[PDB]
């Protein structure tokens, strides 16, 4: 939506004198804009900006403030945006003007965001993002609060509105590029706005942009620690199934690496990795590893994620973890349960403490109200016999034999199925 | 899975990143069905969520095209028979109707 | 005819190549820029601690 | 006109997709370098300031 | 008409990599085009999408195994009449799983 109106505005020039003659602007302002329009070559533009720099931003502000018809205001805004594209350093003239006026840069521009035209307001937003991201003067306090509040309100609209939310997210990203704005945005409820707009089925480009933002947050250790209060990963894992596009797949992989890299604690890494594995990210990483892509980042990140997810799977497969989940009632398909190598290595560990692990399992076989826990108990009891031959008589002693051969008639088909698997384990041979 | 095998064969048949990241395909098509072909590509973009468009290009071709004869149930056997000694050339006189 | 599309793609890819080469080279250049900026931090630290050391004296 | 115009405009959209993908990759490295060399400088300055602190 | 043979012609297509699959699936639904091979210079098993065909072959192998088990057993197989296009999304891997 931005591009066509920008192109039209580049051409929709009109006489700036129309407003000087109406006494809405000053003669020097009109003269500056006319001279700058005539002075088109790069050297001439620099000469104007360096000879009349104090008048430059003042002319822009005066015309934007006092002009009724949009075309001229949009012309100024598009000119500033294109001048920043030509040379990003052009943010410096506004700061020079503000300092000469003994003022900060923000009160001049922030009110523009409340104007009527979506094009003009969002172009002002792009200009503000460029200015306050490149310049020494960051946005702070009530000013940044209102600016990100405006970002939030534009997001709240959630299509031309979505295509403008493209610019909203672009400004947000160009700001988060610098650390301070990241903490400001996390302090605000803006991350909740990202969650809301993502869940509200926003468009593909917007998905890439918000995953860009969460990837920026994950880059920082403390912001990565902060964002768990939302837990994007359950959304992102399944949305990756549809977003096969290289853009989105790459950025989500990068955000995943950032989570598992910049997680501050071993427990933080375990939380993120557990979300991943219980939402089945590991098989997807194996599939993507079989797949091959254009650039380094996608495949290097898939390889790193395979490394770290494998390490997390081994950790969860730790014998101490198995005992601790048995103690904590978390018989809910942690990777230890299906990691066959763990079972081969540690099936004897179920004899430890005089078969306390099997005792927990066989007490849960008549104490577990949760069908998941009951089924996992029966299945683990069967796996014990599968992996440790002498366990046949131990299970007969503890009643796991009878308990599973009965619970294959349990009221929940999942429990019935797992109990049938366990009884098959017992009957693997004599 | 069989359709999937066919489509992966089709995509492996395409030119690759050495030419361009975006995939290129080469096709034989009758001049009567170009609009429908492009429309099928358009439906595909709609399903895939591709805002960037598909594009179909003609090229003045010195190469010999395949041959087709718009067969029907009644005429299929006759067409098979007349082609059994050899498959006709580009829109040459078809012996089937008179045979 | 297809050479037309291939040409335009190769030209857009040349543009991408130069833009992305600048993107990569920015890392190498700003590493040196940071090696420069370390002077600002270290000198500011020294002057501050000089102030408090004078207070202690 | 219509044939040439369609081919040209659609391939221009395809060029734009290519260049925006390249810009997104460039922006990716832009942000990653922002992380990396800045924390590198953080470590260097931390060591320098620790030396200065021991001296003081 | 049948009076003489068809007026066939050559063409080619550009499309984004991701949309290639869905669009050629729609062309399979249409059925009025025949595809060429733009990389005969090296074997089909050494193209961009080797593993994709490898796994389809293996999956069809396993489906033939289970079908053979079905024929050995007494359960029929459902000729429901539905013939849907295979989803391009990574639900492919869900079907795999």
GROMACS .gro file of N, CA and C in nm, chain A residues 295-398:
model
  312
  295UNK      N    1   2.150  -2.054   0.168
  295UNK     CA    2   2.257  -1.985   0.239
  295UNK      C    3   2.297  -2.062   0.364
  296UNK      N    4   2.406  -2.015   0.426
  296UNK     CA    5   2.460  -2.084   0.543
  296UNK      C    6   2.358  -2.091   0.655
  297UNK      N    7   2.298  -1.976   0.690
  297UNK     CA    8   2.229  -1.965   0.818
  297UNK      C    9   2.128  -2.076   0.840
  298UNK      N   10   2.044  -2.107   0.740
  298UNK     CA   11   1.938  -2.205   0.763
  298UNK      C   12   1.997  -2.339   0.808
  299UNK      N   13   2.094  -2.390   0.732
  299UNK     CA   14   2.148  -2.522   0.762
  299UNK      C   15   2.239  -2.521   0.884
  300UNK      N   16   2.318  -2.415   0.904
  300UNK     CA   17   2.399  -2.408   1.025
  300UNK      C   18   2.310  -2.404   1.149
  301UNK      N   19   2.200  -2.328   1.143
  301UNK     CA   20   2.106  -2.324   1.255
  301UNK      C   21   2.036  -2.457   1.276
  302UNK      N   22   1.999  -2.527   1.169
  302UNK     CA   23   1.936  -2.658   1.187
  302UNK      C   24   2.034  -2.753   1.254
  303UNK      N   25   2.162  -2.748   1.214
  303UNK     CA   26   2.261  -2.836   1.274
  303UNK      C   27   2.283  -2.802   1.421
  304UNK      N   28   2.294  -2.673   1.453
  304UNK     CA   29   2.308  -2.631   1.592
  304UNK      C   30   2.188  -2.676   1.674
  305UNK      N   31   2.067  -2.660   1.619
  305UNK     CA   32   1.947  -2.699   1.691
  305UNK      C   33   1.942  -2.850   1.711
  306UNK      N   34   1.985  -2.927   1.611
  306UNK     CA   35   1.993  -3.071   1.631
  306UNK      C   36   2.089  -3.104   1.744
  307UNK      N   37   2.206  -3.039   1.747
  307UNK     CA   38   2.300  -3.062   1.856
  307UNK      C   39   2.236  -3.034   1.991
  308UNK      N   40   2.175  -2.916   2.006
  308UNK     CA   41   2.126  -2.874   2.136
  308UNK      C   42   2.003  -2.953   2.178
  309UNK      N   43   1.913  -2.981   2.084
  309UNK     CA   44   1.797  -3.064   2.115
  309UNK      C   45   1.839  -3.206   2.151
  310UNK      N   46   1.942  -3.259   2.084
  310UNK     CA   47   1.993  -3.390   2.123
  310UNK      C   48   2.051  -3.389   2.263
  311UNK      N   49   2.126  -3.284   2.296
  311UNK     CA   50   2.179  -3.272   2.431
  311UNK      C   51   2.067  -3.264   2.534
  312UNK      N   52   1.963  -3.187   2.504
  312UNK     CA   53   1.849  -3.177   2.595
  312UNK      C   54   1.778  -3.311   2.608
  313UNK      N   55   1.765  -3.385   2.498
  313UNK     CA   56   1.702  -3.517   2.504
  313UNK      C   57   1.783  -3.611   2.591
  314UNK      N   58   1.916  -3.608   2.577
  314UNK     CA   59   2.000  -3.689   2.664
  314UNK      C   60   1.982  -3.649   2.810
  315UNK      N   61   1.979  -3.518   2.837
  315UNK     CA   62   1.961  -3.472   2.974
  315UNK      C   63   1.830  -3.523   3.033
  316UNK      N   64   1.720  -3.508   2.958
  316UNK     CA   65   1.591  -3.559   3.004
  316UNK      C   66   1.594  -3.710   3.018
  317UNK      N   67   1.678  -3.777   2.940
  317UNK     CA   68   1.697  -3.922   2.949
  317UNK      C   69   1.788  -3.962   3.064
  318UNK      N   70   1.850  -3.865   3.131
  318UNK     CA   71   1.930  -3.896   3.249
  318UNK      C   72   1.853  -3.988   3.343
  319UNK      N   73   1.925  -4.081   3.406
  319UNK     CA   74   1.862  -4.170   3.503
  319UNK      C   75   1.803  -4.091   3.619
  320UNK      N   76   1.871  -3.984   3.660
  320UNK     CA   77   1.821  -3.902   3.769
  320UNK      C   78   1.691  -3.836   3.729
  321UNK      N   79   1.683  -3.791   3.604
  321UNK     CA   80   1.558  -3.734   3.554
  321UNK      C   81   1.447  -3.838   3.554
  322UNK      N   82   1.477  -3.962   3.515
  322UNK     CA   83   1.372  -4.063   3.516
  322UNK      C   84   1.318  -4.082   3.657
  323UNK      N   85   1.408  -4.097   3.755
  323UNK     CA   86   1.364  -4.115   3.893
  323UNK      C   87   1.286  -3.993   3.941
  324UNK      N   88   1.330  -3.873   3.902
  324UNK     CA   89   1.265  -3.752   3.950
  324UNK      C   90   1.127  -3.734   3.890
  325UNK      N   91   1.109  -3.766   3.761
  325UNK     CA   92   0.974  -3.764   3.705
  325UNK      C   93   0.885  -3.869   3.770
  326UNK      N   94   0.940  -3.986   3.801
  326UNK     CA   95   0.859  -4.084   3.873
  326UNK      C   96   0.815  -4.029   4.008
  327UNK      N   97   0.906  -3.960   4.078
  327UNK     CA   98   0.871  -3.901   4.207
  327UNK      C   99   0.771  -3.786   4.192
  328UNK      N  100   0.781  -3.710   4.083
  328UNK     CA  101   0.699  -3.591   4.061
  328UNK      C  102   0.571  -3.619   3.983
  329UNK      N  103   0.546  -3.745   3.947
  329UNK     CA  104   0.424  -3.778   3.876
  329UNK      C  105   0.421  -3.736   3.732
  330UNK      N  106   0.534  -3.692   3.677
  330UNK     CA  107   0.539  -3.643   3.540
  330UNK      C  108   0.562  -3.758   3.442
  331UNK      N  109   0.469  -3.854   3.440
  331UNK     CA  110   0.472  -3.963   3.343
  331UNK      C  111   0.394  -3.921   3.219
  332UNK      N  112   0.451  -3.824   3.147
  332UNK     CA  113   0.380  -3.756   3.039
  332UNK      C  114   0.467  -3.747   2.913
  333UNK      N  115   0.526  -3.860   2.875
  333UNK     CA  116   0.596  -3.872   2.747
  333UNK      C  117   0.713  -3.775   2.735
  334UNK      N  118   0.796  -3.767   2.838
  334UNK     CA  119   0.925  -3.702   2.822
  334UNK      C  120   1.016  -3.790   2.737
  335UNK      N  121   1.116  -3.734   2.669
  335UNK     CA  122   1.195  -3.815   2.574
  335UNK      C  123   1.259  -3.937   2.637
  336UNK      N  124   1.281  -3.937   2.768
  336UNK     CA  125   1.338  -4.053   2.835
  336UNK      C  126   1.251  -4.176   2.811
  337UNK      N  127   1.120  -4.156   2.800
  337UNK     CA  128   1.029  -4.270   2.789
  337UNK      C  129   1.045  -4.344   2.658
  338UNK      N  130   1.072  -4.272   2.548
  338UNK     CA  131   1.081  -4.332   2.416
  338UNK      C  132   1.224  -4.343   2.365
  339UNK      N  133   1.323  -4.292   2.438
  339UNK     CA  134   1.463  -4.306   2.400
  339UNK      C  135   1.507  -4.449   2.428
  340UNK      N  136   1.514  -4.531   2.323
  340UNK     CA  137   1.544  -4.673   2.343
  340UNK      C  138   1.683  -4.693   2.403
  341UNK      N  139   1.780  -4.612   2.361
  341UNK     CA  140   1.915  -4.625   2.415
  341UNK      C  141   1.916  -4.607   2.566
  342UNK      N  142   1.840  -4.510   2.617
  342UNK     CA  143   1.829  -4.493   2.761
  342UNK      C  144   1.778  -4.620   2.827
  343UNK      N  145   1.674  -4.680   2.769
  343UNK     CA  146   1.618  -4.801   2.827
  343UNK      C  147   1.719  -4.914   2.829
  344UNK      N  148   1.795  -4.930   2.720
  344UNK     CA  149   1.899  -5.032   2.718
  344UNK      C  150   2.006  -5.005   2.823
  345UNK      N  151   2.043  -4.878   2.842
  345UNK     CA  152   2.150  -4.846   2.935
  345UNK      C  153   2.106  -4.856   3.081
  346UNK      N  154   1.980  -4.821   3.111
  346UNK     CA  155   1.940  -4.793   3.248
  346UNK      C  156   1.822  -4.877   3.296
  347UNK      N  157   1.778  -4.977   3.218
  347UNK     CA  158   1.670  -5.062   3.265
  347UNK      C  159   1.704  -5.126   3.399
  348UNK      N  160   1.833  -5.150   3.424
  348UNK     CA  161   1.875  -5.204   3.553
  348UNK      C  162   1.858  -5.100   3.663
  349UNK      N  163   1.850  -4.972   3.627
  349UNK     CA  164   1.836  -4.868   3.729
  349UNK      C  165   1.702  -4.878   3.800
  350UNK      N  166   1.603  -4.941   3.737
  350UNK     CA  167   1.474  -4.959   3.802
  350UNK      C  168   1.480  -5.057   3.918
  351UNK      N  169   1.591  -5.130   3.933
  351UNK     CA  170   1.612  -5.214   4.051
  351UNK      C  171   1.670  -5.136   4.168
  352UNK      N  172   1.715  -5.013   4.146
  352UNK     CA  173   1.784  -4.939   4.250
  352UNK      C  174   1.690  -4.906   4.366
  353UNK      N  175   1.750  -4.885   4.483
  353UNK     CA  176   1.676  -4.856   4.605
  353UNK      C  177   1.571  -4.964   4.631
  354UNK      N  178   1.609  -5.089   4.603
  354UNK     CA  179   1.521  -5.204   4.619
  354UNK      C  180   1.392  -5.186   4.538
  355UNK      N  181   1.411  -5.159   4.409
  355UNK     CA  182   1.300  -5.155   4.313
  355UNK      C  183   1.198  -5.047   4.348
  356UNK      N  184   1.246  -4.934   4.402
  356UNK     CA  185   1.155  -4.825   4.436
  356UNK      C  186   1.090  -4.765   4.312
  357UNK      N  187   1.162  -4.764   4.199
  357UNK     CA  188   1.104  -4.711   4.076
  357UNK      C  189   0.987  -4.796   4.029
  358UNK      N  190   1.007  -4.928   4.024
  358UNK     CA  191   0.897  -5.018   3.990
  358UNK      C  192   0.785  -5.008   4.092
  359UNK      N  193   0.818  -4.988   4.220
  359UNK     CA  194   0.715  -4.974   4.322
  359UNK      C  195   0.631  -4.850   4.297
  360UNK      N  196   0.695  -4.739   4.260
  360UNK     CA  197   0.621  -4.618   4.224
  360UNK      C  198   0.530  -4.648   4.105
  361UNK      N  199   0.583  -4.717   4.004
  361UNK     CA  200   0.503  -4.746   3.886
  361UNK      C  201   0.382  -4.832   3.921
  362UNK      N  202   0.402  -4.934   4.004
  362UNK     CA  203   0.295  -5.027   4.038
  362UNK      C  204   0.196  -4.970   4.138
  363UNK      N  205   0.237  -4.869   4.216
  363UNK     CA  206   0.140  -4.796   4.297
  363UNK      C  207   0.060  -4.700   4.211
  364UNK      N  208   0.124  -4.636   4.113
  364UNK     CA  209   0.052  -4.549   4.021
  364UNK      C  210  -0.045  -4.629   3.934
  365UNK      N  211  -0.016  -4.756   3.910
  365UNK     CA  212  -0.108  -4.837   3.831
  365UNK      C  213  -0.243  -4.855   3.900
  366UNK      N  214  -0.254  -4.825   4.030
  366UNK     CA  215  -0.383  -4.825   4.098
  366UNK      C  216  -0.410  -4.693   4.168
  367UNK      N  217  -0.323  -4.593   4.153
  367UNK     CA  218  -0.345  -4.461   4.211
  367UNK      C  219  -0.361  -4.351   4.107
  368UNK      N  220  -0.328  -4.374   3.980
  368UNK     CA  221  -0.323  -4.267   3.881
  368UNK      C  222  -0.464  -4.237   3.831
  369UNK      N  223  -0.515  -4.119   3.866
  369UNK     CA  224  -0.640  -4.073   3.808
  369UNK      C  225  -0.620  -4.030   3.664
  370UNK      N  226  -0.502  -3.982   3.631
  370UNK     CA  227  -0.474  -3.935   3.496
  370UNK      C  228  -0.451  -4.054   3.403
  371UNK      N  229  -0.532  -4.072   3.298
  371UNK     CA  230  -0.507  -4.184   3.206
  371UNK      C  231  -0.369  -4.180   3.143
  372UNK      N  232  -0.315  -4.062   3.115
  372UNK     CA  233  -0.179  -4.054   3.063
  372UNK      C  234  -0.080  -4.118   3.159
  373UNK      N  235  -0.088  -4.082   3.287
  373UNK     CA  236   0.003  -4.138   3.386
  373UNK      C  237  -0.016  -4.288   3.397
  374UNK      N  238  -0.141  -4.334   3.399
  374UNK     CA  239  -0.166  -4.478   3.410
  374UNK      C  240  -0.107  -4.553   3.291
  375UNK      N  241  -0.131  -4.503   3.170
  375UNK     CA  242  -0.080  -4.568   3.051
  375UNK      C  243   0.072  -4.570   3.051
  376UNK      N  244   0.135  -4.459   3.089
  376UNK     CA  245   0.280  -4.454   3.088
  376UNK      C  246   0.336  -4.548   3.194
  377UNK      N  247   0.268  -4.561   3.307
  377UNK     CA  248   0.313  -4.655   3.409
  377UNK      C  249   0.309  -4.797   3.357
  378UNK      N  250   0.198  -4.836   3.294
  378UNK     CA  251   0.190  -4.971   3.239
  378UNK      C  252   0.297  -4.994   3.133
  379UNK      N  253   0.315  -4.896   3.043
  379UNK     CA  254   0.412  -4.909   2.936
  379UNK      C  255   0.553  -4.921   2.990
  380UNK      N  256   0.588  -4.840   3.090
  380UNK     CA  257   0.721  -4.847   3.149
  380UNK      C  258   0.742  -4.979   3.221
  381UNK      N  259   0.637  -5.030   3.286
  381UNK     CA  260   0.647  -5.161   3.351
  381UNK      C  261   0.677  -5.268   3.247
  382UNK      N  262   0.611  -5.261   3.132
  382UNK     CA  263   0.640  -5.357   3.026
  382UNK      C  264   0.781  -5.341   2.971
  383UNK      N  265   0.824  -5.216   2.953
  383UNK     CA  266   0.958  -5.190   2.901
  383UNK      C  267   1.065  -5.244   2.995
  384UNK      N  268   1.039  -5.238   3.126
  384UNK     CA  269   1.134  -5.293   3.222
  384UNK      C  270   1.156  -5.442   3.198
  385UNK      N  271   1.048  -5.517   3.178
  385UNK     CA  272   1.062  -5.660   3.149
  385UNK      C  273   1.131  -5.679   3.015
  386UNK      N  274   1.098  -5.596   2.916
  386UNK     CA  275   1.162  -5.609   2.785
  386UNK      C  276   1.313  -5.595   2.797
  387UNK      N  277   1.358  -5.498   2.876
  387UNK     CA  278   1.499  -5.461   2.880
  387UNK      C  279   1.578  -5.533   2.988
  388UNK      N  280   1.512  -5.600   3.082
  388UNK     CA  281   1.580  -5.668   3.192
  388UNK      C  282   1.510  -5.802   3.215
  389UNK      N  283   1.569  -5.914   3.171
  389UNK     CA  284   1.495  -6.041   3.174
  389UNK      C  285   1.447  -6.082   3.312
  390UNK      N  286   1.528  -6.064   3.417
  390UNK     CA  287   1.487  -6.109   3.549
  390UNK      C  288   1.367  -6.033   3.601
  391UNK      N  289   1.334  -5.919   3.540
  391UNK     CA  290   1.222  -5.839   3.585
  391UNK      C  291   1.088  -5.907   3.571
  392UNK      N  292   1.082  -6.019   3.498
  392UNK     CA  293   0.956  -6.091   3.485
  392UNK      C  294   0.900  -6.128   3.622
  393UNK      N  295   0.982  -6.193   3.704
  393UNK     CA  296   0.937  -6.234   3.836
  393UNK      C  297   0.918  -6.114   3.928
  394UNK      N  298   0.997  -6.008   3.910
  394UNK     CA  299   0.979  -5.887   3.991
  394UNK      C  300   0.842  -5.826   3.964
  395UNK      N  301   0.802  -5.819   3.837
  395UNK     CA  302   0.672  -5.766   3.800
  395UNK      C  303   0.560  -5.858   3.847
  396UNK      N  304   0.579  -5.989   3.839
  396UNK     CA  305   0.480  -6.081   3.894
  396UNK      C  306   0.465  -6.059   4.045
  397UNK      N  307   0.576  -6.038   4.115
  397UNK     CA  308   0.571  -6.013   4.259
  397UNK      C  309   0.497  -5.884   4.290
  398UNK      N  310   0.531  -5.776   4.219
  398UNK     CA  311   0.471  -5.645   4.244
  398UNK      C  312   0.329  -5.634   4.191
   0.00000   0.00000   0.00000
